[PDB]
Amino acid sequence: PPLLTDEMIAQYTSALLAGTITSGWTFGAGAALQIPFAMQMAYRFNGIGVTQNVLYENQKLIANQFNSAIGKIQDSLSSTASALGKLQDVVNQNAQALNTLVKQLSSNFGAISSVLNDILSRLDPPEAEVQIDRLITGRLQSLQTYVTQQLIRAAEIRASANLAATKMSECVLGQSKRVDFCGKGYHLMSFPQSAPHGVV
Amino acid sequence: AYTNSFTRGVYYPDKVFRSSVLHSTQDLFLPFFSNVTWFHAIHDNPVLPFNDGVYFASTEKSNIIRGWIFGTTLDSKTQSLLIVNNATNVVIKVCEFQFCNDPFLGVMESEFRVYSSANNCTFEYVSQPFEGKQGNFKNLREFVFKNIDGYFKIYSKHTPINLVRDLPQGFSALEPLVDLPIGINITRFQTLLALHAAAYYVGYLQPRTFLLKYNENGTITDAVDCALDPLSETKCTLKSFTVEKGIYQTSNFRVQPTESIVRFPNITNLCPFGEVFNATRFASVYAWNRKRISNCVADYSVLYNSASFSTFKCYGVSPTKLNDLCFTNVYADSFVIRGDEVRQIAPGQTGKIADYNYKLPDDFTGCVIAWNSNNLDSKVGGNYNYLYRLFRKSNLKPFERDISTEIYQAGSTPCNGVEGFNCYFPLQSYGFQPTNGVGYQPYRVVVLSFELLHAPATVCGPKKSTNLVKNKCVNFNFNGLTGTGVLTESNKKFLPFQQFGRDIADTTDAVRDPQTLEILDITPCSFGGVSVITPGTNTSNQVAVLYQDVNCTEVNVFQTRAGCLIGAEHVNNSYECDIPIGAGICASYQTSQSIIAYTMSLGAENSVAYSNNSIAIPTNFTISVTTEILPVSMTKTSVDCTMYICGDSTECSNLLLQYGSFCTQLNRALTGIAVEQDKNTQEVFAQVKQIYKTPPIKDFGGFNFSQILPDPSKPSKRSFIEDLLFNKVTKFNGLTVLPPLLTDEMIAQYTSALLAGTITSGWTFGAGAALQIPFAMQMAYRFNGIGVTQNVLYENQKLIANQFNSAIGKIQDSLSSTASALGKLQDVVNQNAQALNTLVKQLSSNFGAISSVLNDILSRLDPPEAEVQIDRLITGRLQSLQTYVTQQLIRAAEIRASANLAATKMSECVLGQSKRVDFCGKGYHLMSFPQSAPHGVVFLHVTYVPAQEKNFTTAPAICHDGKAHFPREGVFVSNGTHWFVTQRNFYEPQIITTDNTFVSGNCDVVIGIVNNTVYDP
Amino acid sequence: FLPFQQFGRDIADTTDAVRDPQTLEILDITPCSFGGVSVITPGTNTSNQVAVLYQDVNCTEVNVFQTRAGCLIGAEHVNNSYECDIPIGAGICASYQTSQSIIAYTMSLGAENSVAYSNNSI
Amino acid sequence: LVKQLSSNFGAISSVLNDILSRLDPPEAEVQIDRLITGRLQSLQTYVTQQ
Ligand SMILES: *[C@@H]1O[C@H](CO)[C@@H](O[C@@H]2O[C@H](CO)[C@@H](O)[C@H](O)[C@H]2NC(C)=O)[C@H](O)[C@H]1NC(C)=O
Ligand SMILES: *[C@@H]1O[C@H](CO)[C@@H](O[C@@H]2O[C@H](CO)[C@@H](O)[C@H](O)[C@H]2NC(C)=O)[C@H](O)[C@H]1NC(C)=O
Ligand SMILES: *[C@@H]1O[C@H](CO)[C@@H](O[C@@H]2O[C@H](CO)[C@@H](O)[C@H](O)[C@H]2NC(C)=O)[C@H](O)[C@H]1NC(C)=O
Ligand SMILES: *[C@@H]1O[C@H](CO)[C@@H](O[C@@H]2O[C@H](CO)[C@@H](O)[C@H](O)[C@H]2NC(C)=O)[C@H](O)[C@H]1NC(C)=O
Ligand SMILES: *[C@@H]1O[C@H](CO)[C@@H](O[C@@H]2O[C@H](CO)[C@@H](O)[C@H](O)[C@H]2NC(C)=O)[C@H](O)[C@H]1NC(C)=O
Ligand SMILES: *[C@@H]1O[C@H](CO)[C@@H](O)[C@H](O)[C@H]1NC(C)=O
Ligand SMILES: *[C@@H]1O[C@H](CO)[C@@H](O)[C@H](O)[C@H]1NC(C)=O
Ligand SMILES: *[C@@H]1O[C@H](CO)[C@@H](O)[C@H](O)[C@H]1NC(C)=O
Ligand SMILES: *[C@@H]1O[C@H](CO)[C@@H](O)[C@H](O)[C@H]1NC(C)=O
Ligand SMILES: *[C@@H]1O[C@H](CO)[C@@H](O)[C@H](O)[C@H]1NC(C)=O
Ligand SMILES: *[C@@H]1O[C@H](CO)[C@@H](O)[C@H](O)[C@H]1NC(C)=O
Ligand SMILES: *[C@@H]1O[C@H](CO)[C@@H](O)[C@H](O)[C@H]1NC(C)=O
Ligand SMILES: *[C@@H]1O[C@H](CO)[C@@H](O)[C@H](O)[C@H]1NC(C)=O
Ligand SMILES: *[C@@H]1O[C@H](CO)[C@@H](O)[C@H](O)[C@H]1NC(C)=O
Ligand SMILES: *[C@@H]1O[C@H](CO)[C@@H](O)[C@H](O)[C@H]1NC(C)=O
Ligand SMILES: *[C@@H]1O[C@H](CO)[C@@H](O)[C@H](O)[C@H]1NC(C)=O
Ligand SMILES: *[C@@H]1O[C@H](CO)[C@@H](O)[C@H](O)[C@H]1NC(C)=O
Ligand SMILES: *[C@@H]1O[C@H](CO)[C@@H](O)[C@H](O)[C@H]1NC(C)=O
Ligand SMILES: *[C@@H]1O[C@H](CO)[C@@H](O)[C@H](O)[C@H]1NC(C)=O
Ligand SMILES: *[C@@H]1O[C@H](CO)[C@@H](O)[C@H](O)[C@H]1NC(C)=O
């Protein structure tokens, strides 16, 4: 099992959202300092070279556009399964890797039979160890292949996790000046959401 | 009665010197803390059984205990070892002897019970010539007596004592003294007492694995009984007598079967073997008979044991393990051949019969049965009724009966009506006569072809079935198909023709019982990993055991989603995670003290006092210093594949050449790694074009850098902190280590240059030339870069310098006292060291060979057989290197990524100032300082952290003359009576003026605007 | 060694020492010196002169310059530092310089420079 | 990878067709199995490096 259950992850994302919403970026550096959300947005606008008065004069429009955009996100996630393909493939790759490994137990690898107990029950030791050695070599090689693939895939996941942590820190906890690091456009804020074996 | 064996019974297992090493060995040792029977000399000593070895010990002050008797019957029928120490002559005898009901010697001997017989003696040895009081003992004499294949090994240790008590506690190893080359079947033994205190102990040895600690003198000083308890198992797994705090996976729990289940179809028919082996006439090889035997009980023990067959050779099956297998059908191919033709009837064989009259499959799984027939098929003057075929225009497929008698065409001439040149008949016959040679007598051969249980079986051996027991782990056998698991009822509706079920993975899921047609699911019995949760041995020897993914109903006790955890107390209170278990559960050693398990806390619960018109603005700040440790490089290696695999052996090397480029691709891959380690180091540290140095006068505005700057008084110009770091982080098999290109001095010089640049020129030396600037002014820019006006620094410069200096002192105290601070770098060193040790250990492996040492193979076997054993070693050692190299390439990729990150930080934190949140520590980044470390870099990140906040009333805008005023910088705040404008990150209230705010629009659009006045200077 | 001990072992299980069966003294067995051999050369478009580095051995069994990378034979030891060209290890690099010959030297880390720091000068 | 096809891996010959044309199946599969093991290991090495 994972060390952190889904409930604990949800609680962590809840804490991050409440901090982001009520204290902006201040909770990242130190203490969470409460601030009105509209004023937080004013800073977020100033950070992109847009004077804060634009937000206040158009605050109703901005809130309506945000709420509509969120509704569209919900409609997309509720109807297009391929949206999460990036995470589903990871699950599939691991599931496929284990199924292949299991299938290797059915292979003979040159032996008279893939089932070891039928070998032991049929041959006396002096001839049986040769057939067993063939199965040991094949199954050991199969595990080594699996483990190597898992180490490489793990390196890929680690790189992705490091990227996700970087985004969390420089987008959710702060405000990003890195172009297209946190989506197309001038970044204002980001919100984390948990997902199976990943973050959204 | 009984006493507790206090770690006694440890002897040197062999005659090899070892030192400063923990060696794991399996041998016959006395189990730790076991019960040993306590016998007394006063008030008649019984005979005890001998059972795979005896531990014997006695305590003496006057040599009351003088001998031993070992054997089985002690009645002159077998050899019995007799050892007597009569203060003058140590005597060892293996003569046969008739002993008295209670043998003893009086105090020199005064009575005749020493022995009564001297017959059939095979060995004698006598050593050189050389009271009855009671009290505390003076001499403890411990012995081990064991019999292995033919050597009777006696180990012992004598030690002075001044004590009466039973088996003193402490540790002492027993050296070998005697090895008697005689194989005596010993089942019982007796001791010999001197009669005019002096007790002795008898324990028994068991095959256990022990971990023995050899000191610098090669003396065994301690030991771990690897099966005593989970903690000892942990110690064995880590090959250490000290266990760090954490959870280790040490073993696997597996439920064992209780009983076997043998099930077979309830058929009572017997197989007609007599009608095949005992027949009046066998068929000819051109027209051999094939009887199918099915739906019967085949007793193959009778045919095998009968002393009438000339040969009984089985392929595919073993001739003995034939009763516990069953077949869908068995076929008996029966025919007569010439004795000399027996060699041709075999899979893979050729000859005039193998190709023309009887061809076998090359995957045949049957038996070749033969006996001579000189007194049955042979007739006087030659029996001419057995026909063979010596010519054919084509080769038989396996199991073909070529009955056709067509005129063989040796050429293109017309035949089939012609028996002239190149038209001859292929059928020829034998003349079996009682006077012909052995190779020419008739033999009756029957080959029994057996297929495997690929489908339902009908012909099973003569063994009765048993009843079936459900819902228990059993060893089952259904129609010859065997396995282990719990047999349960199922609701899987098999069709009448279906006998077996399968899972997605092709495993057996369920079977139909051949006697009562119900479907039984087979679920393999519960198993899982076993992990030991323990605080470090510097705290407590109490452990908890986690049985992974099983219920605790077959093994206080706490059931968790990780498995059932035994030994840990369940605590309702949450805490920070210490030793993780899984599924939200962690364990720790807390309050006497005991191991507890709990749901982990995720942090303190806190709420934010949010409202639409209240802002918290910091009034004070703290300068913090954090330490970030990154790997940059790993020890570079190069392996000579030939010397490793084929050390100083030309023949092995010559065999290695048959593998092509396998060596050079490994040498190349490791070279590539070694090169990139220098690239990584160069990229991280050599980012400065010049070597900068600080002035002799450290006038840095009150900032004390003496603990990060080079110390001119040291033998290596490293900083104090660097010296602390270096004091915390700690070859003839073709394995070498290359030096790094950049020595530690050069790295220190690079970090010195970076520090002097950072201190004296800020970030300007990174972009171009190093432009000198006062440090306080540099800090002013660093403060401006985080939205804090530079006047804050100057007004609080003394405070800031004192906080910085104190933070540095704390860094020094931490690095000087907490070793785990550098764990991130130490693990890298350990991973590389461990990887090489494993590689070296692989040289000791046999990989199926008769011996792991190649020179002993070469010196013992002639080449024609030796290359096979060598090829096995080459394959194993080559695979081991490939595993090592792959792991190194992956680890190198990890190190490269870390080095790239470190270089990125160097550039965007040390050389510049970082806007990336939490990239260079928590807080608003000001500056960073590099420090070198073994195979890595340490960054000291200096951050500004807001502290001491107050609740202020705020507003997004102020209306004045109907115009809406917004802050240029800062926010509008009110202390309850007056409105001020102030910077976001530091409370510094200013009067609201037209030079602080700007006007846009009017006061009717913006939500939360308040009425006030804006002062016009 | 104790009287019953005949062979010694290292941490790696290799034979470390033996007791001579005729005269009971303990002899350490150290496998004879070996190591990789590397060739340091400028490109063949410049010169056919090379230097040979015998890795991690002393040059007492094989001008001659002993370094911490091994004993380097054929390269002249130069007191003057320069920028690294062909790296050897342990701070030593080699290059083809001035007739011309192969030289070995401690690498320069860059020009030495000081910053004219003071509390009131920018 | 291509060069590995020229290796014997313990076989009497690296070229498979000469094995098949020279030995009857009952002995030829052993030599072929040696070549299969060597060539399969070579591919696995290549793929891991890739
Ligand atoms: C060692 O000696 C014991 C006698 O104590 C042998 O045990 C006997 O074995 C035979 C079997 O041939 C039985 O008939 C006897 O009844 C056994 N004796 C007792 C007292 O039970 C044992 O077989 C001997 N082993 C060897 C290898 O010689
Ligand atoms: C800001 O905090 C610092 C400490 O973090 C304060 O300095 C301390 O002031 C008290 C006075 O009450 C002294 O007794 C301490 O010795 C000071 N410590 C240090 C390290 O200087 C500072 O006064 C605070 N400033 C404000 C305005 O509250
Ligand atoms: C910078 O801090 C160091 C301590 O880390 C100071 O060195 C100490 O100075 C005091 C005098 O005030 C001596 O009594 C200590 O023995 C010194 N310790 C060491 C380890 O040198 C150093 O003086 C400080 N620099 C300045 C300019 O004050
Ligand atoms: C809010 O800040 C103002 C500005 O300092 C405070 O007004 C001053 O109060 C002190 C004593 O209360 C007087 O001596 C000053 O003359 C006042 N300044 C002016 C310009 O009149 C005000 O009291 C503060 N309010 C609270 C609740 O602390
Ligand atoms: C701030 O001042 C303006 C003008 O002095 C106030 O506007 C008046 O508000 C009252 C009550 O809502 C209306 O009846 C008047 O017609 C408004 N006059 C104008 C010119 O708009 C405003 O309400 C004041 N705001 C506060 C919070 O006191
Ligand atoms: C030792 O013997 C006593 C009595 O026979 C028994 O109660 C005790 O459990 C035994 N100890 C062990 C470890 O078996
Ligand atoms: C000890 O026993 C041996 C056994 O024969 C005997 O020869 C010897 O004389 C004895 N020594 C005495 C009685 O001092
Ligand atoms: C062994 O002792 C017995 C004792 O009766 C004797 O008859 C026999 O001849 C002796 N020798 C052998 C070889 O059994
Ligand atoms: C063992 O080591 C100690 C180390 O102090 C040394 O004094 C002693 O002579 C050595 N030999 C023996 C037999 O103790
Ligand atoms: C014999 O086999 C039949 C076949 O189903 C079974 O019904 C019967 O009970 C069996 N008899 C015994 C004694 O097991
Ligand atoms: C065949 O005959 C021999 C001798 O007459 C006998 O020993 C053997 O058991 C018989 N075969 C069978 C299957 O009974
Ligand atoms: C760890 O062990 C050492 C030596 O046994 C001891 O000095 C030290 O205090 C121990 N640490 C703790 C935390 O008990
Ligand atoms: C574990 O055993 C208990 C005891 O009978 C049982 O009630 C429970 O269902 C079992 N399985 C679990 C907890 O998954
Ligand atoms: C823990 O909480 C449970 C509530 O179900 C309670 O029954 C139990 O007694 C509590 N234990 C302790 C030690 O407080
Ligand atoms: C701010 O006000 C809220 C509610 O009045 C209070 O809970 C909180 O502690 C206050 N914060 C400070 C720093 O006084
Ligand atoms: C939010 O602000 C409005 C005026 O801008 C005020 O009426 C309302 O009460 C405020 N919210 C709360 C919770 O007081
Ligand atoms: C014979 O062996 C003994 C045993 O140590 C030794 O002392 C003696 O020198 C040897 N003799 C010769 C001639 O080597
Ligand atoms: C390299 O060789 C080419 C052709 O041999 C020549 O034209 C070129 O000048 C050479 N370069 C140097 C630097 O000598
Ligand atoms: C190398 O050889 C010299 C020449 O005798 C010797 O002095 C030195 O100690 C040896 N070992 C080294 C340099 O490590
Ligand atoms: C190099 O410096 C050393 C100083 O130990 C000196 O003896 C030697 O002659 C110098 N060589 C040259 C070429 O300057």
Residue having the nearest C-alpha atom to atom 4 of ligand 15: B609
Pocket flag, ligand 10, residue B268 (CB < 6 Å): no
Residue having the nearest C-alpha atom to atom 2 of ligand 10: B266
C and B touching (3 or more beta-carbon pairs closer than 8 Å): yes
Q: Residues with Cβ < 8 Å from B860, sequence gap 6 or more?
A: B866
Chain A residues in contact with B984 (beta carbon < 8 A): 43
Alpha carbons B359 and B353: distance in angstroms, whole number: 7
Residue B968 neighbours by CB distance under 10 Å: 12
Chain C residues in contact with B750 (beta carbon < 8 A): 109
Which CATH number goes with the domain that contains B189? 2.60.120.960
Ligand 10 centroid to Cα of residue B263, in Å, is 12
Q: Quick one: angle between helices D25-49 and B662-685, nearest 10?
A: 10
Number of A to B CB contacts under 8 A, please give it.
Answer: 172
Helix, strand or coil, per DSSP, at residue B799:
helix
Chain D residues in contact with B871 (beta carbon < 8 A): 10
- Roughly how many angstroms between the first and final C-alpha of chain D, as a whole number? 12
Contact B918 A2 (CB under 8 A): no
**Gyration radius (Cα) of chain A, Å:** 27
Ligand 12 centroid to Cα of residue B21, in Å, is 23
Tokens 């040696």, residue?
D34
Q: Which residue of D has its CA nearest to A144?
A: D44
* Phi, psi angle pair for C20, to nearest 5°: -60, 125
CA atoms within 13 A on the CB side of B834: 9
Structure tokens given for A25: 């970026």
CA proximity to B755, closest of B807, B698, B702:
B698
Give the number of the atom of ligand 7 that is nearest the alpha carbon of residue B93.
4
Alpha carbons B938 and B719: distance in angstroms, whole number: 12
Least CB–CB distance from A52: residue in B610, B894, B966: B966
CA proximity to A45, closest of A34, A60, A56, A32:
A56
CA proximity to B691, closest of B631, B739, B745, B740:
B745
Task: Locate breaks in chain C with C to N over 2.5 A; list the residue preceding each.
Answer: 62, 98
Contact A173 B918 (CB under 8 A): yes
Alpha-carbon gap: D21 to the closest alpha carbon of chain B (Å): 16
Render B222-278 in DSSP notation, one character per residue.
EEEETTS-HHHHHHHHHTSS---SEEEEEEEEEPPPSSEEEE-----PBP--HHHHS
Ligand 16 centroid to Cα of residue B167, in Å, is 84
**CB B839 within 8 Å of CB B884:** yes
* A180: DSSP letter: B
C28 bridge partner residues: C17
Amino acid at the residue B191:
T
B646-650 contacts, C-beta under 8 A, 24 or more apart: B646/B854, B646/B874, B647/B733, B647/B734, B647/B854, B649/B854, B649/B855, B649/B858
- Roughly how many angstroms between the first and final C-alpha of chain A, as a whole number? 22
Would you say how long chain A is, in residues?
A: 200
Task: Give the start-end residues of each E strand in chain A.
Answer: 194-195, 198-199
Resolution in A: 3.3
Pocket flag, ligand 7, residue B89 (CB < 6 Å): yes
Choose the residue to mutate in B612, B615, B1006, B1011 for probing ligand 16, maximizing ligand atoms within 8 Å of C-beta.
B612
Chain B residues in contact with C85 (beta carbon < 8 A): none
Least CB–CB distance from B325: residue in A121, A169, A177: A121
Alpha carbons B494 and B556: distance in angstroms, whole number: 45
CA proximity to A59, closest of B1001, B915, B204, B970:
B1001
The burial class, CB within 10 Å (0-12 / 13-18 / 19+), for B727 is: exposed
**CB A117 within 8 Å of CB B483:** yes
Contact D44 A145 (CB under 8 A): yes
CA proximity to B396, closest of B361, B424, B369:
B361
Q: Torsion angle, CA of B212/B215/B219/B224, rounded to 10 degrees?
A: -20
Ligand 19 centroid to Cα of residue C34, in Å, is 16
**CB B920 within 8 Å of CB B626:** no
Pocket flag, ligand 4, residue B950 (CB < 6 Å): no
Helix, strand or coil, per DSSP, at residue A58:
coil
Q: Give the strand pairing for B188-195 and B105-106.
A: parallel
Alpha carbons B455 and A18: distance in angstroms, whole number: 65
**CB B365 within 8 Å of CB B317:** yes
Cα dihedral B719, B725, B731, B734 sign: negative
Least CB–CB distance from B661: residue in D3, D10, D25: D3
Alpha carbons B782 and B762: distance in angstroms, whole number: 9
Q: Identify the contact set of chain B against chain D, taking CB-CB distances under 8 A.
A: 347-348, 350, 362, 655, 658-661, 665, 669, 871, 882, 886, 889
- Biggest alpha carbon–alpha carbon distance for chain A: 91
Domain that holds residue B42: 2-254
* B740: DSSP letter: P
Alpha carbons B950 and B619: distance in angstroms, whole number: 7
Contact B946 A31 (CB under 8 A): yes
Residue having the nearest C-alpha atom to atom 13 of ligand 7: B108
Contact A145 D33 (CB under 8 A): no
Chain A residues in contact with B1000 (beta carbon < 8 A): 51, 53, 57
CA proximity to B134, closest of B87, B198, B64, B59:
B198
